Amino acid sequence: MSELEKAVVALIDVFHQYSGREGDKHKLKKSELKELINNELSHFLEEIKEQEVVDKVMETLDSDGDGECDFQEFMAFVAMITTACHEFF
C-alpha cells in the first residue's frame, strides 16, 4: 500500500481502536475521545486532564447532539487538525 493508502487505513484503524472500547462500538463516548486525544494526538494538541474540558471538546465535535463522536464527526475533527498542520507546513 502507498503512503496515502496507509494513512487512510490508519484513520480508520485508530478510530475503531478507541470507539470499540465501550458501549456503542462505532462511536467515541467522552472517555474514549479523551484517550484518543491523549494517546494519538499528544504532539499536536494539549493533553486533556479535566472532564469539563473533555465535555467541551465533545459538544464541539458532536454535531448531531447525541453526546458521542461518530466516524463522520471524527473525520471533521481530523480535517480540522490536518488543515492546521498544512497551514503550519
The span of 6-14, 27-35, 47-55, 59-67 binding its own copies (CB under 8 A) equals 6-14
Which DSSP state fits 68?
A: S
Q: Does 64 appear as a known binding residue?
A: yes
Q: Does 86 appear as a known binding residue?
A: yes
Does 88 bind ligand Z80 (CB under 6 A)? Our answer is yes
How far, in Å, are 5, 24, 32, 66 from residue 60 at the CA level?
A: 29, 20, 16, 12
* Residue 24 C-beta-side C-alpha neighbours within 13 Å: 11
Q: Tell me, residue by residue from 22 to 61, as one string, x for binding to ligand Z80 by CB under 6 A and - for no binding.
A: ---------------------xx-----------------
* Binding-site residues: 16, 19, 22, 24, 26, 62, 64, 66, 68, 73, 86
